Amino acid sequence: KPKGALAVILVLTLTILVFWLGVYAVFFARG
Amino acid sequence: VDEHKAHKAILAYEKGWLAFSLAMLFVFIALIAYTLATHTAGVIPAGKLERVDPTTVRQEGPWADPAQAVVQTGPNQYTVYVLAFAFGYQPNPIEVPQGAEIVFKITSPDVIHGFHVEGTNINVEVLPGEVSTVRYTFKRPGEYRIICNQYCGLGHQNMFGTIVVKE
Amino acid sequence: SRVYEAYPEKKATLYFLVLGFLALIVGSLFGPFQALNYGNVDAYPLLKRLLPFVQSYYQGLTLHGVLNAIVFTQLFAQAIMVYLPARELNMRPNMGLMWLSWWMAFIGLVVAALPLLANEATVLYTFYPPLKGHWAFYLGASVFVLSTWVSIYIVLDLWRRWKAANPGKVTPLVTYMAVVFWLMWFLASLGLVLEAVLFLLPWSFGLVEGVDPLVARTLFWWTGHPIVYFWLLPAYAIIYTILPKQAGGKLVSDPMARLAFLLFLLLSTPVGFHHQFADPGIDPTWKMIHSVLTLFVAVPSLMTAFTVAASLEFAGRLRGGRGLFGWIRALPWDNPAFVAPVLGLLGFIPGGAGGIVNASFTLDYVVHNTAWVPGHFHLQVASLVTLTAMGSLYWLLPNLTGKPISDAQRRLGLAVVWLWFLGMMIMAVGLHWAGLLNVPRRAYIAQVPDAYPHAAVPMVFNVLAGIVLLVALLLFIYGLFSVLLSRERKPELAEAPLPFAEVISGPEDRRLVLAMDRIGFWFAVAAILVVLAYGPTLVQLFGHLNPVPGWRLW
Numbered sequence: 011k012p013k014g015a016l017a018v019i020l021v022l023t024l025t026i027l028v029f030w031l032g033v034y035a036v037f038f039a040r041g
Numbered sequence: 042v043d044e045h046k047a048h049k050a051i052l053a054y055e056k057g058w059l060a061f062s063l064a065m066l067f068v069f070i071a072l073i074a075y076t077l078a079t080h081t082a083g084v085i086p087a088g089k090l091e092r093v094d095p096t097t098v099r100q101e102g103p104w105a106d107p108a109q110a111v112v113q114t115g116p117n118q119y120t121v122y123v124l125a126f127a128f129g130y131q132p133n134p135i136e137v138p139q140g141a142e143i144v145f146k147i148t149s150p151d152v153i154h155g156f157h158v159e160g161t162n163i164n165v166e167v168l169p170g171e172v173s174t175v176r177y178t179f180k181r182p183g184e185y186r187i188i189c190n191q192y193c194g195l196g197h198q199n200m201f202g203t204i205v206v207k208e
Numbered sequence: 209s210r211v212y213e214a215y216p217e218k219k220a221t222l223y224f225l226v227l228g229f230l231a232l233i234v235g236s237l238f239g240p241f242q243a244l245n246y247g248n249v250d251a252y253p254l255l256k257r258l259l260p261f262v263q264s265y266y267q268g269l270t271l272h273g274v275l276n277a278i279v280f281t282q283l284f285a286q287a288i289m290v291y292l293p294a295r296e297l298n299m300r301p302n303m304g305l306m307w308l309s310w311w312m313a314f315i316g317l318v319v320a321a322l323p324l325l326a327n328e329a330t331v332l333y334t335f336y337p338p339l340k341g342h343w344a345f346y347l348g349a350s351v352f353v354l355s356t357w358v359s360i361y362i363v364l365d366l367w368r369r370w371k372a373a374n375p376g377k378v379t380p381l382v383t384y385m386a387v388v389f390w391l392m393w394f395l396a397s398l399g400l401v402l403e404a405v406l407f408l409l410p411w412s413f414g415l416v417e418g419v420d421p422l423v424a425r426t427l428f429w430w431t432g433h434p435i436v437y438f439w440l441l442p443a444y445a446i447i448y449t450i451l452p453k454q455a456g457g458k459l460v461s462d463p464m465a466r467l468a469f470l471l472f473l474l475l476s477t478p479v480g481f482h483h484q485f486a487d488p489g490i491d492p493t494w495k496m497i498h499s500v501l502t503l504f505v506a507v508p509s510l511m512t513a514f515t516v517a518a519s520l521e522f523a524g525r526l527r528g529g530r531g532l533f534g535w536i537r538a539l540p541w542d543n544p545a546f547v548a549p550v551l552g553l554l555g556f557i558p559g560g561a562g563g564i565v566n567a568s569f570t571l572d573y574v575v576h577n578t579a580w581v582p583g584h585f586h587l588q589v590a591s592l593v594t595l596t597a598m599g600s601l602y603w604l605l606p607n608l609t610g611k612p613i614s615d616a617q618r619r620l621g622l623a624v625v626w627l628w629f630l631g632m633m634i635m636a637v638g639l640h641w642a643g644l645l646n647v648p649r650r651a652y653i654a655q656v657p658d659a660y661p662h663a664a665v666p667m668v669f670n671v672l673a674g675i676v677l678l679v680a681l682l683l684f685i686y687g688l689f690s691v692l693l694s695r696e697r698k699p700e701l702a703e704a705p706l707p708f709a710e711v712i713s714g715p716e717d718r719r720l721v722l723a724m725d726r727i728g729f730w731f732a733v734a735a736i737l738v739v740l741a742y743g744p745t746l747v748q749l750f751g752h753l754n755p756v757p758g759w760r761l762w
């Protein structure tokens with residue numbers, strides 16, 4: 011199995027989620 | 042064999058990643074749709090085209106007297122006629138009550154400006170010949186800075202205004 | 209040289225590449241001064257003693273955007289996406305059209321450059337009306353961009369001459385990428401061409417009195433999204449078809465590479481209202497439709513992440529790396545042609561994450577027109593695209609000129625790409641963080657030093673980046689001129705083949721490649737998506753034109 015490639019898309023996924031949920035929280039705080 | 046095993050195993054995992062990918066993007070669409078059904082949606086500019094002549098907006102109509110720019114249009118609703126121009130905002134300050142719905146009607150007599158109210162989601166481009174309409178309710182009293190965040194010429198970095206929200 | 213009589217496309221390719229890197233050098237000199245500004249340090253008094261034609265911060269920012277994001281990226285795209293398909297097919301481009309392409313780009317650049325240098329078009333690389341630039345800027349920019357229409361014809365010619373000689377054969381992979389790339393760009397380019405011919409040119413010449421700024425922005429951003437996929441795809445072509453060989457491996461899938469490129473043909477153009485979330489007089493329903501299509505255009509890059517990662521992991525295992533992380537250390541970190549694009553892909557992780565936030569309609573009101581947006585796009589174009597272009601000079605310049613790269617030039621190359629990458633990451637932290645503190649983009653903030661006291665910590669990052677990237681730029685200038693002004697030549701490196709990767713094949717591949725080879729069908733679909741996405745708003749806007757007078761405020 012491509013375990014190295016899986017570790018890369020895991021770090022991509024966590025970065026996307028931190029960015030997106032972080033800004034969602036800011037939007038409601040300013041709303 | 043090892044290249045053909047690799048290739049089969051790579052594609053198997055890529056199919057799962059792609060299904061997960063779509064699932065995530067669909068959840069983001071649902072969470073965006075939710076924002077559109079709440080009060081937070083008032084910062085979206087009105088889609089209506091509302092045309093004005095930038096050459097007369099300082100001489101005739103609701104932008105011509107900044108001291109009468111704040112109009113009660115509802116029992117807990119005020120409409121504010123704001124001019125963004127090279128290089129300032131009128132009226133200055135904008136004075137409004139805490140807790141009321143504010144309908145900003147912003148236009149330009151010259152070039153494109155930004156209207157970004159620090160601490161809020163009010164963040165709208167202001168086009169000459171068009172009215173940008175946004176609504177917001179201030180929950181906290183105090184002074185809020187207006188920042189011009191569209192390049193408007195050499196005075197851009199000094200183009201600031203003031204909203205004062207009264208208890 | 210006998211080389212250039214057999215392969216004259218080598219000399220035309222070289223003229224595109226060098227003119228592009230000259231544009232990159234001149235544009236990038238403003239970069240460190242702009243980063244110091246976003247650190248609250250005003251260095252413009254010093255820049256004006258060294259370049260006394262610079263009148264303002266905003267004239268510098270116009271030169272920066274035009275020369276780096278429009279001129280360098282276009283000339284790189286024209287070099288790579290004509291030369292690589294020619295060499296894959298072993299066929300000669302129409303050399304008359306190839307030289308015409310070049311002369312159009314060169315003459316457009318010279319004509320646009322004149323009013324930029326004389327302070328007659330300080331309107332930034334978006335030139336939004338009613339800010340009214342000199343007619344020579346709009347004319348020059350028009351001619352520059354239309355050089356790409358000749359590029360398109362040259363590649364479609366190559367493809368139809370190959371197909372006529374090979375009936376029943378599938379398009380080879382690199383030529384496939386270049387064909388759907390150039391057809392995408394044809395559709396993409398029409399917004400800006402229409403804005404230029406109907407509005408900016410007649411207005412600039414004094415033949416109409418005003419322009420409708422909402423129409424102009426709408427036509428601009430038709431082209432303004434897909435132009436960033438135009439910048440990206442030549443880097444992706446190298447990363448798919450050349451990087452796996454340089455890593456010691458193979459491309460793990462021809463079909464999933466083709467499919468990424470096909471989704472860009474379909475989804476790159478009909479998305480531009482994601483640049484207009486904060487614009488009046490565009491229906492919120494259409495903004496939501498563009499935001500959903502924008503989330504879909506992310507899919508081909510999410511796919512690229514997996515395909516590329518799996519191919520680098522493969523190469524690393526074949527080179528003896530074991531475990532979940534040992535494959536990384538087994539890769540050739542001594543080779544700048546390998547390192548540059550891979551560091552670029554690392555920065556593209558947070559770059560892509562910021563892009564998905566920007567796309568999400570109402571979340572854009574948090575970040576629109578703040579320092580966040582330049583933080584996002586320096587990770588995409590100023591790092592991935594630029595680093596990939598810098599790395600390609602280690603294999604492309606010997607192949608065009610027969611000039612070898614010394615071991616010393618190799619080591620200097622490694623220092624340049626590491627400092628460029630590290631400087632971009634540091635600046636990304638500074639600009640993303642300043643953006644969340646409401647610091648505006650496009651602003652000479654160093655001239656109002658007490659206006660943003662809350663941003664003192666991220667400003668320290670922007671000062672550091674400015675210094676690191678100044679050093680990276682000076683080392684790059686020295687390296688590039690050491691190779692082009694070197695007297696040693698070895699013509700057998702000009703005759704060597706390009707380092708194209710081998711592909712691992714599977715039973716699936718043939719049936720998916722022939723569905724994707726129906727290029728006429730997929731082009732038709734891409735064209736229809738543009739009509740549906742734009743048509744109804746444009747009939748609205750054109751029905752209700754409100755042209756307004758022009759202003760000069762500089």
Ligand code: HAS
Binds near residue numbers: 502505506550572577
């Ligand atoms: C090349 C240049 C660019 C690319 C690519 C790019 C991508 C995106 N952008 Fe963007 N952008 C926006 C949305 C996106 C989205 C959804 C994507 C997507 O295409 C991004 C998808 C990318 C990914 C999902 C990343 C995948 C990750 C990969 C492929 C790396 C894997 C790493 C590996 C394999 C390494 C592993 C190796 C080891 C050794 C471990 C939006 C709004 O939706 C705005 C307007 C905001 C505003 O308010 O003005 C915007 C603004 C800009 C502007 C400013 C225009 C201006 O001046 O006003 C520029 C120049 C720009 C450039 C670029 N942008 N963008």
Ligand code: HEM
Binds near residue numbers: 269333590
């Ligand atoms: C040494 C390298 C560089 C540094 C230090 C740097 C720094 C900056 C900074 C701080 C800004 C923001 C200025 C503002 O908003 O007022 C900026 C804008 C920009 N940069 Fe760069 N930059 C560099 C290289 C590049 C490269 C290589 C590209 C493209 C290939 C690029 C494209 C842009 C664009 C398109 C803008 C926005 C212009 C506009 O808003 O009108 N930069 N740069």
Ligand SMILES: CCCCCCCC/C=C\CCCCCCCC(=O)OC[C@H](O)CO
Binds near residue numbers: 038068
């Ligand atoms: C296998 C499992 C399948 C199912 C998995 C599905 C994942 C659900 C995701 C999002 C929830 C959406 C709910 C939206 C509610 C938003 C509430 C909110 O954000 O409230 C804060 C704010 O203050 C309000 O005004």
Ligand code: CUA
Binds near residue numbers: 126154196198200
């Ligand atoms: Cu008004 Cu910038």
Ligand SMILES: [Cu+2]
Binds near residue numbers: 432433434482483
């Ligand atoms: Cu875009």
